[PDB]
Design an enzyme around this catalytic site. Structure first.
Site, short mmCIF file in Angstrom:
data_model
loop_
_atom_site.label_atom_id
_atom_site.label_comp_id
_atom_site.label_asym_id
_atom_site.label_seq_id
_atom_site.Cartn_x
_atom_site.Cartn_y
_atom_site.Cartn_z
CG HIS A 67 52.28 47.35 60.90
ND1 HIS A 67 51.60 46.52 60.03
CD2 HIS A 67 52.65 46.58 61.95
CE1 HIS A 67 51.57 45.30 60.53
NE2 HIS A 67 52.21 45.32 61.72
CG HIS A 71 50.78 49.15 65.85
ND1 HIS A 71 50.00 48.20 66.46
CD2 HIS A 71 52.00 48.60 65.64
CE1 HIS A 71 50.72 47.09 66.58
NE2 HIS A 71 51.95 47.33 66.15
CG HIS A 105 56.83 47.50 68.15
ND1 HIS A 105 56.01 48.54 68.53
CD2 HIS A 105 56.08 46.62 67.48
CE1 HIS A 105 54.79 48.29 68.06
NE2 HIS A 105 54.80 47.13 67.39
CG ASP A 106 55.59 47.52 64.10
OD1 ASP A 106 56.27 46.60 63.65
OD2 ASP A 106 54.43 47.38 64.47
CG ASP A 216 53.14 43.67 67.84
OD1 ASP A 216 52.67 44.77 67.49
OD2 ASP A 216 53.92 43.02 67.18
CD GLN A 268 40.74 38.63 62.90
OE1 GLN A 268 40.79 39.03 64.05
NE2 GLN A 268 41.82 38.61 62.14
#
Ligand code: JUC
Ligand code: MG
Ligand code: ZN
Length: 312
Positions: A67, A71, A105-106, A216, A268
């Site tokens: 993050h 990213h 956004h992060d 995202d 996953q």
């Protein structure tokens, strides 16, 4: 005036959904400006304010494994590709708002989930009871916009300014994957019963929310070596959170326990089947030209299946 340009391989490949922004950190700001200029215009922002905004946003991302600033820019490029492939479906304000939203956004992420902040009893969990980090990310966005010479939206009107900040707030809150599940189910039903209407503001809101989830999660839509190596950065965080859960005397979820490394391939699969595939499926029904994201996701699911079968 001054068009940003890129080397030829980047100029061509930046247009594709599967583009990787590369390991040269100093090129990431120029890549973002290039994307604003093509998706929005050379007139959207004062270049000097935009440059100052990008550099303060970068400094407020932390050196965590996943993050991080890379990213942020990665999630903005996926948005760019969506907007360039659906030219005439978005307002000028949406073009303006959504790339800034993805870059922001992060902001000030610490490598921990909303759930760990709540169990640690972090002050942010008393300030924001749900979507804890995401309300923090929006708060950091407004802080940076209000620094001297950082208001890239200064040329909009009172009401255009309130609209753009409202587009950004909703877009950033939608990156809380807890809200994804219910948002996609609603979009699924609205699309199948034929009630989906892009003139209905609350419908557009939902469609932008899904676009934010899609951007995202876009690491699952890359060339397999990008996907697989990004997966390592994601788990470096999850496993540190697991460690911090065990220091609070709490058994982490399997996802976050480094003792259960061997199950990664199967986790996953869970994620592709429960989250990613249904995300890109619904997105492709609403916006047909985003189909390459669904196809790349499906390709990566089949690479994870190969890892389980011992063929990789
Ligand atoms: C949450 C995420 N976000 C990504 C974003 C980008 C790229 C990969 C990403 N992978 C993941 C991710 C990783 C992972 N590993 C798991 N296991 C269980 C033990 C061991 F086997 C690994 C299990 C899951 N669930 C099944 C999730 C299903 C949806 O809600 C959260 C739980 N997930 N999800
Ligand atoms: Mg986030
Ligand atoms: Zn993110």
């Amino acid at each position: 005036l001054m068009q940003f340009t890129l080397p030829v391989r980047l100029c061509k490949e930046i247009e594709l959904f599967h583009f990787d922004i590369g390991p040269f950190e100093n090129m990431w700001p120029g890549i973002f400006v290039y994307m604003v200029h093509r998706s929005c215009g050379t007139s959207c922002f004062e270049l000097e304010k935009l440059c100052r905004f990008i550099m303060s946003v970068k400094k407020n991302y932390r050196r965590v494994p996943y993050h991080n600033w890379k990213h942020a820019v990665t999630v903005a490029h996926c948005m760019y590709a969506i907007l360039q492939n659906n030219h005439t479906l978005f307002t000028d304000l949406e073009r303006k708002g959504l790339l800034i939203a993805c870059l922001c956004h992060d902001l000030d992420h610490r490598g921990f989930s909303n759930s760990y902040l709540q169990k640690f009893d972090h002050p942010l969990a008393a300030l924001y009871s749900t979507s804890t980090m995401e309300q923090h990310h929006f708060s950091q966005t407004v802080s940076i916009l209000q620094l001297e010479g950082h208001n890239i939206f200064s040329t909009l009107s009172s009401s255009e300014y309130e609209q753009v900040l409202e587009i950004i707030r909703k877009a950033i809150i939608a990156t809380d994957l807890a809200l994804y599940f219910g948002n996609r189910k609603q979009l699924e039903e609205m699309y199948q019963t034929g009630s989906l209407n892009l003139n209905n503001q609350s419908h557009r809101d939902r469609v932008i929310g899904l676009m934010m989830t899609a951007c995202d999660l876009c690491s699952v839509t890359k060339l397999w070596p990008v996907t697989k190596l990004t997966a390592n950065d994601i788990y470096a965080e999850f496993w540190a959170e697991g460690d911090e859960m065990k220091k609070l005397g709490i058994q982490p979820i399997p996802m976050m326990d480094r003792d259960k490394k061997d199950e990664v391939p199967q986790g996953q699969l869970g994620f592709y089947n429960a989250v990613a595939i249904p995300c890109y499926t619904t997105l492709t029904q609403i916006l047909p030209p985003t189909e390459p994201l669904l196809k790349a996701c499906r390709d990566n699911l089949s690479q994870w299946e190969k890892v389980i079968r011992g063929e990789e």
